[PDB]
């Protein structure tokens, strides 16, 4: 009717406004997309030129005011670190893994509150799937001696460790100092739980079923303590007394980490004593004992490293 | 030395500049991040108010110049589509699936050349993994009658269909009109290839091994024709004569799509005749015949839908 168009025009009176407002935004979006690329080639050509200055300096300090020359070291150690806080608000480019899974989308959070809010969502993610991986691995272990439910647990374990590699790769390019092992221990665990699906139900599977299930039920319990430490370390780093918490959550975490690292060792030697048995006929016995042997030496000799660097600091 | 610092200062004569330049960028980045949210709440409150105008009109046209009332339709048919080209340069928010896998990162490409360059990379991705899924499924089918290599093919098939759901979900929020089935046919195929790993090597597996392997070797060959059509429809839509190609690549695609849809039907009825056999003892016989029965009715009655809408246009 008449008024039916009267309200139709009182709403398009400002549709000229957003149409006007959306012009001055795609213009801002396009001039901002060039300020990023401008600011990216200019701090990357200086940095590659900066290290060139260091090598020209590195060769002389052995041959040589002993520190008058290394007074230039702390001059380019913070500056190269100044470039790192610069490059933290510039869009990076995906690595070989994210370009595979996601393509060439941009995954860098261009804020300091957005890297936080994403690393908080990441710790909550590992906690919510820890409440599922400890409820599904408890029925599997105690309530149901089945194989369709045990294969549904390894399909969650595979999907949960594949989602970690993706989320730990979005953290790694948005400014996270995740040591190389922790991102590899997820590929090793996806593999170890992948060869766990191909394992035919038989006599060796029922002899390692209780060990694997009650370990990945413990490995979820220790991820409840990792959460409360990890999320307490990122909610306190945002805002001396922080090393009194860090050296308290760690003291109450290491015994539960080393009881887990020596359960992976025990889980490996088992699959090596299940192989020497004639009733064994499956390669999956040996090809699980090696991941449990990698995950031991990798996790153990890295958690010791993390404490060897925190002891000095 | 002396000149060793002379070049140290000639390189930081502009480090005051980028430090200056990087201030005026994070300021632009922060005022742009507010222009997006400003422009997002203003075209979403008008749109939800726009449909309100339509319902206030929709009730009167049956009860009632009746076309002077319905000329309001095409007045807000493209207007609501005008909002769709607006919202195409604003960052969306991830759906329930991307928020699971990726978190709350932003995955929308804010350009028209960036949505193209990402949908081109997506078609090339499906082509490169089609050359792997046709080389690994040919050895499996003809060269190697093994089980560790057949389980390595289903682990690629699972990973390939899980990477499609992620990449088809980044397309869907960056402006792609992918029909609901095509994104579901990937969850059905991941499941069907997931219950293909749990299938214990036995007597029923060796009776369906040749069918499944030679189908997923055909299904890769038809993805060579899908690529050259999909990428030909993507490089021509960028730049009458386009319906002469579209109705030619389609004419040479439908016979290869319906020979594939009636192979999924044949693959389903087989797993229903492998169940009625006493020598069958595995639920995986039935739980594959249903996905092959979904993938038939879903793919077939959707490819017919796609041709039923292109016939009218
Ligand atoms: C000591 C420990 C508990 C955490 O200490 P930490 O202070 O967080 O480690 P770092 O000082 O090296 O910091 C590395 C960065 O990556 C994170 N990080 C540390 N361990 C990580 C891990 N396993 N996975 C992902 N991120 C990790 C840290 O939060 C930090 O992030 P940020 O600097 O961007 O904020 C670590 O050894 C750990 O997490 N071990 C788990 C291994 C395990 O599960 N063993 C049992 C198997 S049954
Ligand atoms: C007809 C067909 C070949 C493609 O026609 P089409 O014109 O591309 O489809 P539409 O017109 O509906 O367009 C839908 C959108 O999603 C894309 N699309 C179409 N089919 C798609 C599919 N299976 N997967 C992903 N995207 C698809 C289109 O490229 C288009 O993208 P865009 O508009 O953002 O540029 C389609 O039926 C198809 O791809 N079928 C494949 C199913 C199959 O593999 N069967 C054999 C199984 S053995």
Numbering used by the authors:
A (entry chain B), B (entry chain A): 9 to 72, 76 to 250, 262 to 335
Paper text:
Each protomer consists of six TM helices (S1–S6), which form a barrel surrounding a tunnel open to the cytoplasm. The TACAN protomer is related in three-dimensional structure to a fatty acid elongase, ELOVL7.
To determine the identity of the small molecule implied by the broken density in the tunnel of TACAN, we determined the structure of TACAN with His196 and His197 mutated to alanine at 2.8 Å resolution. The map showed clearer density consistent with a coenzyme A molecule (CoASH). Native mass spectrometry (nMS) was used to confirm the identity as CoASH. The purified TACANH196A H197A sample contains a mixture of the 83,237 Da, +767 Da, and +1535 Da mass species, corresponding to an apo form, one and two CoASH bound forms, respectively. After incubation with CoASH, some fraction of the apo form shifts to one and two CoASH bound forms. Additionally, the +767 Da and +1535 Da species are replaced by +795 Da and +1591 Da or +811 Da and +1622 Da species after incubation with the two CoASH analogues S-ethyl-CoA or Acetyl-CoA, corresponding to the CoASH analogue bound forms.
